Structure formats: structure tokens, C-alpha cells
Design a binder for this molecule. Sequence first.
Ligand SMILES: C[C@@H]1O[C@H](O)[C@@H](O)[C@H](O)[C@@H]1O
Length: 413
Amino acid sequence: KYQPTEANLKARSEFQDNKFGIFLHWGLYAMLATGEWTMTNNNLNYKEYAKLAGGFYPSKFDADKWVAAIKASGAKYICFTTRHHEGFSMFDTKYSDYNIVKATPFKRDVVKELADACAKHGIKLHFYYSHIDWYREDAPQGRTGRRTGRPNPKGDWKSYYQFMNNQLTELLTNYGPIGAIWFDGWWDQDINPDFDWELPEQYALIHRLQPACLVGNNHHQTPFAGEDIQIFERDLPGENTAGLSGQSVSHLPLETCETMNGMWGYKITDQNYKSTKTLIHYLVKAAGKDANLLMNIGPQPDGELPEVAVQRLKEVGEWMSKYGETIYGTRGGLVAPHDWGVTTQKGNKLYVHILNLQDKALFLPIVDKKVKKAVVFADKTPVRFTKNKEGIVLELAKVPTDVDYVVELTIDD
Ligand SMILES: C[C@@H]1O[C@H](O)[C@@H](O)[C@H](O)[C@@H]1O
């Protein structure tokens, strides 16, 4: 069965170490500015929808600007939608003329420009790839895309499968080293429990071209053999407030994805961006649950990242410059997430992230381990603490009102 290589295991460790990445959802749907599900939500004819590519020209696109804005947040990788459910390829593929170079006046391989900029800024680059397709006539139809006017609902699974494997070969050979392939769409065939996605062969292909490329699949299931990371959508592992994540937590590297407003693709009615404080909290709570955070922006049809999104990124980076040592290269801390906050850990250090506390003292259930030292991370002032039957009790100088009041504990062994 699945034997992950030494390189793959190293890449899993580096992934868990980086903690924070940015999701970019960009395609033809940015013209419509009503969301990447609009083609199926509105039952748009597939040929009519394809006509939009003739008017696609994000004149202000600047991959360098994007990646500099993203790096100023402290994020270490980008996950970019190379091709979403709409079926439009944002890269110069030779297996379909329905792509940004051939089909639009822009005539520019957006994916290549991104990969170059990412390489220049030392930001790893992951590729989102859609297992389902609402445009191609050989794509089989599950629950979505049943009213786009296509002629063969059953599709030609052999043709379409060969097409995906050839495009993945393109993406893995032409754009230098690729952090991960992020598959999505599996849930589209869940109504058909016998649907054979032929995943062993595809994962084998990916690992055969680049053995350190991680493989994820947003299937909301217990991971399948050959996957290298587990995806939780709009929820933290073991949580299910958004209704998409009832699956158990595995021993694979965990990653949570989330939007900065309410949608993945650019939405012109939706300018309700979460505060900087909410965003830092998402990141820290994820780290405290031993998971990465993948935070999304939907770029505009003129090619600029939304301005408010960029300012949020800038302010999150201002916080990260001060507190990143408590997040980077850590794992889920020895003390489970509580209502007051979370803990992370690295070496002999356990970081207590006090996010939400009304008191001037905090009880921690640390029994076996001995707490050798306790200081305020920000300036290294003492934290008095007393042992008791069930743990320790920190005595704080004030009721914390910071975004994250971090106390650094040194433990033995
Ligand atoms: C990552 C998100 O998860 C869902 O399954 C997708 O269908 C959304 O459009 C988005 O890509």
C-alpha cells in the first residue's frame, strides 16, 4: 500500500512548520462577481458562459504585487486555483483551448507569473485542481452542473480522466517545484457510492513526478491511502459548526481553510471582511489544534487583490513580526484548546495564548510535566505561578485585553 518517501515526510514536517498560507480563488467568475458557484447556481449555458473569456482582461494584475502583499502577512505559501468547477484553466495548457492564454485577450499564463514571483519571494506554491467540471462534455455529472445544457450527462470518464492526468503532468513539469496538489470535487459523486475516482493511479503520478509534493483531497472523509495532508473546510479538526466536517482526525498534517469575507471567489456585494483580531484568532486557534490555516482572498476581475484584504494582511503581518516565534515551527500544545485560548509548543517551550480571559489568573492542568519557568513572551517579565493538585495557576499582572496575551513556559524534558 502507501509508502511515503523520506522526501515526502520531510515536506510534511516543513508544511506543519509553516502554519499559515493564503487561498486565491480566481477565474472567469470574477467577471460575474457573484461567486465561483454561479454557473451551477444560475443554470448558465456552458457555451454562453464560455463567451465571457473574450472579455477577460485583468489589466492591473501584478504577480509581484500579490506575492509581496501576501508575504507581508507572514504567510509562507499560496494555494491558487489553477482550474475550478467552471472548467477554465488559468494556465497555458495544450489539452484545452479554454484557458487564459488562448481564449482571452489577456494572453498571459497567470500561473507562470505567480510561480516566478513565489520563487522570487521564497513563498511555496500549491495548486488547487477541480475533480469536477461543468464545461467539458466528457465530464460526468454528479449532483452539480446538471443544467448547463451539456449533451451527455454520463460523460466519457476515460477521456476526462486522461485529460486531468495530462493537465496535472503539465502543472507538475512546467512550473518548477510545487508544494502541494489540492484536489476538490469528490463530494460531487457521493450520491454514487460506487464511483471509481481512480485515485491510487493519480496520486502515484503526482508522487512520481515530484515525490515531495503533498497530496490533499477536500473529500470531508477519513483520508485515502496516498494522501499526505487532511483538509478541514471552514472548521477546525473535530469541530463541525459550518456543517462540512464530521470526519475523524487522522495522523496526517491537518489544514483548515476559511474565507476572509464570506465567499471564495470575488463577490461585489460582499465587503464584510473579518477584523484583524478575528483573523489572528483563526490562525492561533488553528495552531493550537495542531493545524495550518489557509485564509482566502478572491481577486477582482481587474487583477487587483481587494484593498481591504491587503490591509488586513498587512496588519496580521504586523502582529506576526512580534509573535511569529509562538506559531512558526510549533505543534499543537500539550494543553487542549479552552475557552480562554490555546497552547502551542516547540522544543522545551509551551506557549499559552490567552485570547479570552476575564480574570487576573489562569489555571493550567499541567500535572506530570514540571514548569521550570514562566514569563510574558512580549517583554520577558515574570509570571508568578503556584502548583496544586490538578496543575498550576498563573497570577497575571492585569486582566488581558490583548489580541493574544502570550505567556511562555519552559518545561523540563
Ligand atoms: C475550497 C472550497 O471548498 C468547496 O468544496 C468548493 O466547492 C468551494 O467552491 C471552495 O473551493
